[PDB]
Design a protein around this ligand. Sequence first.
Ligand SMILES: Nc1ncnc2c1ncn2[C@@H]1O[C@H](CSCC[C@H](N)C(=O)O)[C@@H](O)[C@H]1O
Ligand SMILES: [Zn+2]
Length: 454
Amino acid sequence: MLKKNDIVEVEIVDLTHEGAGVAKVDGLVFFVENALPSEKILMRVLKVNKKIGFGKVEKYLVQSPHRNQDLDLAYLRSGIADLGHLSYPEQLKFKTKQVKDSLYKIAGIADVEVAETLGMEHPVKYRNKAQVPVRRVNGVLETGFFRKNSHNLMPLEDFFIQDPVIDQVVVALRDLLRRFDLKPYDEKEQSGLIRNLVVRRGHYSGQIMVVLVTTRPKVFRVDQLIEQVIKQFPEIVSVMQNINDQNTNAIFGKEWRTLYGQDYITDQMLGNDFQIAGPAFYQVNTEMAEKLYQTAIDFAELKKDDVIIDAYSGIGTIGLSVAKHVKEVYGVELIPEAVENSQKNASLNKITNAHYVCDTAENAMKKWLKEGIQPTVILVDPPRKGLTESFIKASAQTGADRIAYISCNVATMARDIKLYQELGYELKKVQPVDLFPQTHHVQTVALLSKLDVD
RNA sequence: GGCACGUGCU
Ligand SMILES: Nc1ncnc2c1ncn2[C@@H]1O[C@H](CSCC[C@H](N)C(=O)O)[C@@H](O)[C@H]1O
Ligand SMILES: [Zn+2]
């Protein structure tokens, strides 16, 4: 048949959503990491199931003219920048094409124009949050990253796609942790203290939250450590602790503590102040997220009498940025620390017509329906699993004219759009936005409406 | 190998 270590010549014909590398050998589809369309390779077979996968490039016979040859990127490719080996112009085209192909294949839609993916002018150094594991390598505490489905620390200081100030803070903390003899975590032994660093920095404000993810609550001399990090980075307004005593892949455990300062940072979006807790969600590309939100707000054509639902509201960024131009805003968020942020953020921006609830989107929608709230627009911003059929049905029963769907996954978006079409909402506009350059993640704004005029 | 309600997308 074909055996688990064979070398065979193959032509790469397509890219998967995740940035492999599609070939056909014998009868089977193979996924090859770091292989682009139009390339001819010798492929080393890693794994043979029926009727899929998986190979590795042994040799390039012909390379793609769109391949980025940067060796520094090539080390990041599996961990940080999934698509860094493809040129930026082709990353955008690839993301546009995926949206088109999803709407066609899954929802039957071919009659609607999908705009060209809106790209970032300087598609680098954009992330406002870093999550970095801390491990012992050759008896020395090292920071870096993990590759896909691996737990072997790849040392790294320059993360390519994050705020260089965050890189500096991580390195400074790495060196400080060494100077205070704090032991790093070891997954094999379950020994040590420091598991992870999470560092968030406001894109406009520059304010920094450091999170130390530890196995135990007591961190010897941590207050003296903090005094010194604050001295080199006065922008740090918050140092949090998160305790994770389990042996799991999850970064955070249940318990949070405040070690210094506040339990939030403040950053600006669309000219408003937002407080952001450690466990709350905040878009990591603040620049492009503004364009994403502005796109959705423009799609919605909000007027002074509109009633908006901001579902999957987070810290209230979308809803609060429109509440002064609108009659009422109703929002729902699952994470309590984010809902508490959104309530404070309303007060903070002198907003009196926002109503945030801590629930599941689906049974908040059900409550608002039973309470007789009459929304005219529904803004949704779900995670990758999309909306539940229960939410879609319920949102539609309100009779809201416009729905503005912000997606981070085209497969689930297209599924949900299909059901909205069945319920009388026509897909009107689609604008992909590149929130995560150099990665496989695609972000889309869709406008669905039941008005023939839009 | 992953993902979405024993096949559907990747
Ligand atoms: N079933 C659910 N109901 C309500 N919120 C949910 C949820 N599942 C996930 N969430 C939350 O929904 C958000 C998805 S990301 C969007 C957040 C926000 N609109 C912003 O862009 O800033 C996160 O805040 C996540 O914690
Ligand atoms: Zn994805």
